[PDB]
Amino acid sequence: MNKYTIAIDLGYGQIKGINQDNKRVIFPSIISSGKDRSLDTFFNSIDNIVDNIHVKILDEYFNEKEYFVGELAKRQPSNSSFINRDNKINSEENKVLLATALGLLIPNDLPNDTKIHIVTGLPLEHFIKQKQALNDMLKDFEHTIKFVDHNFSRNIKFEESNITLFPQGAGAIFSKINNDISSLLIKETFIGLIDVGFKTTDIVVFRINKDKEPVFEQEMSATLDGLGMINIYNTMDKAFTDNSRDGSKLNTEQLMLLCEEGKIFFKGDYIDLKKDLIKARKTLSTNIINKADGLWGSRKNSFNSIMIAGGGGKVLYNHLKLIEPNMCQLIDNPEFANAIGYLEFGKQF
């Protein structure tokens, strides 16, 4: 039989993955040590595993470790702080996320002889830099995952010539739109994906040729490293302590709940910080537009379709529209632009 295919993303906000059979999972990039759950099972019936990932993972010692990951880790008081999370792609923090991303996206009772084309991702300026670090991790990733309170296990191990690395935004606009953007690309134009992520924002362009095929440019395209949603959480963390004036600083959930809405429910009251949320987004909108003119001279006028991506692009699509209005548009899945872009451009082999 043919080899299976899974395209995941190790993005800093949330793991965004999809398989060969077009089933997708999404959960935030927070881990926590798992503790025994049969009690909270009894109060509320679990119909979603994604909310409730209690899970055991074997290792090279074949020693299991309980984990809370995803939505269940965010409610825990003892989880990862998630603002000082490592960029080391071979870390166990990245392993458990990658274990669950490969754990959910495998259906039951597959033949054990076949292997899976896994397709991961890297930052654009850190693709070459962190190429062999994930190559070492995926060669080292020999683990057996066991979902507690769902009771289905996967033996996840990969040899050589099965992993496939791509940069972020590589196949999201090269592929994934090529069947639909081919009528829009005409002659010597630039398409551009702008993925607004957690830690970084990512700019990738593709010149199409005379023969209507896109080709890459790296001096018009880079990673806005350290510029992204991370500037919004850190600013709005100070915005609460400026508005509380008590020394009360938000925890992991309260800050993440804040920048989605702007009204944290503090002491039986919503503390209004909608205006400072606009200001932190506008400074992020400042630091992507002015950096775009650093990468683009008059070639911003040489665009036919700007696309913006990322979950951070969802709340900023009309706000980051001021790059080139009436030409920029939204990618059809704002979160899953990279993953399906990894899927279609991973099936080219």
Ligand X SMILES: Nc1ncnc2c1ncn2[C@@H]1O[C@H](COP(=O)(O)OP(=O)(O)O)[C@@H](O)[C@H]1O
Nearer to a copy of itself, 36 or 60 (CB): 60
Give the strand pairing for 263-265 and 303-309.
unpaired
Strand (E) or helix (H) holding 134: helix 131-140
Q: Are 185 and 87 contacting, i.e. CB atoms less than 8 angstroms apart?
A: no
Total of chain residues touching ligand X, rule CB under 6 A: 19
User: What does the per-residue mask of binding to ligand X show for 224-253, with x meaning CB under 6 A?
Assistant: -----x------------------------
CB 71 within 8 Å of CB 51: yes
Q: Tell me if 197 contacts Mg ion by CB under 5 A.
A: yes
| Span of 4-12, 38-46, 68-76, 278-286 interacting with a copy of itself by CB under 8 A | 278-286
Residue listed under structure tokens 């080709």: 215
Q: Of ligand X, a copy of itself, Mg ion, none, which one sits near residue 61, judging by CB under 5 to 8 A according to partner kind?
A: a copy of itself
What are phi and psi for residue 162, nearest 5 degrees?
-120, -30
Positions in 281-310 near a copy of itself (CB under 8 A): 282
Q: Looking only at residues 134 through 173 of this chain, which bind a copy of itself when binding is defined by CB under 8 A? A: 142
- Which residue in the set 38, 247, 275, 290 belongs to the binding site for a copy of itself (CB under 8 A)? 275
Of the residues 60, 109, 113, 260, which one makes contact with a copy of itself according to CB under 8 A: 60
Provide the phi-psi class of 118: left if phi over 0, else alpha when psi is between -120 and 50, else beta: beta
In the bound state with ligand X, the residue whose beta carbon lies nearer, of 103 and 310, is 310
Smallest gap from Cβ 107 to Mg ion, in A, equals: 25
11 binds Mg ion (CB under 5 A): yes
Using a 10 angstrom Cβ sphere, with 0-12 exposed, 13-18 middle and 19 or more buried, the burial of residue 162 is middle
Nearer to ligand X, 137 or 229 (CB): 229
Residue 150, token pair as written in the block: 């769902």
Closest separation in Å from C-beta 153 to ligand X: 28
Count the Cβ atoms, other than its own, within 10 Å of residue 278: 13
User: What DSSP designation does 155 have?
Assistant: E
CB of 256 to ligand X, least distance (A): 6
- Tokens describing residue 260: 């989605």
Q: How far is the CB of 281 from a copy of itself (least distance, A)?
A: 12
Q: Is residue 169 near Mg ion by the rule CB under 5 A?
A: no
Answer for which of 5, 6, 11, 171 binds ligand X (CB under 6 A) is 11
Beta bridge partners of 26: 16
- CA 80, CA 207: separation in Å to the nearest integer? 41
Closest contact distance (angstroms) between CB of 150 and a copy of itself is 28
Among 7, 13, 117, 177, binds ligand X (CB under 6 A): 13
For 21, the 3-state DSSP assignment is coil
Pick the piece of the chain touching ligand X (CB under 6 A) from 71-79, 81-89, 296-304, 311-319.
311-319
| Cα(268)–Cα(270) distance, integer angstroms | 7
For residue 189, the one-letter residue type is: T
CB 158 within 8 A of CB 141: yes
Q: Which of 335, 339, 341, 342 binds ligand X (CB under 6 A)?
A: 335
Q: Which residues contact residue 33 at a Cβ distance below 8 angstroms, ignoring those fewer than 6 apart?
A: 65, 66, 67, 68, 78
Are 87 and 226 in contact, with CB atoms under 8 Å apart?
A: no
Closer CB to a copy of itself, residue 43 or residue 61?
61
- Write out the residues near ligand X by the rule CB under 6 A: 9, 11-14, 16, 197-200, 229, 259-260, 310-312, 314-315, 335
- Write out the residues near Mg ion by the rule CB under 5 A: 11, 195, 197
- Write out the residues near a copy of itself by the rule CB under 8 A: 60-61, 142, 275, 278-279, 282
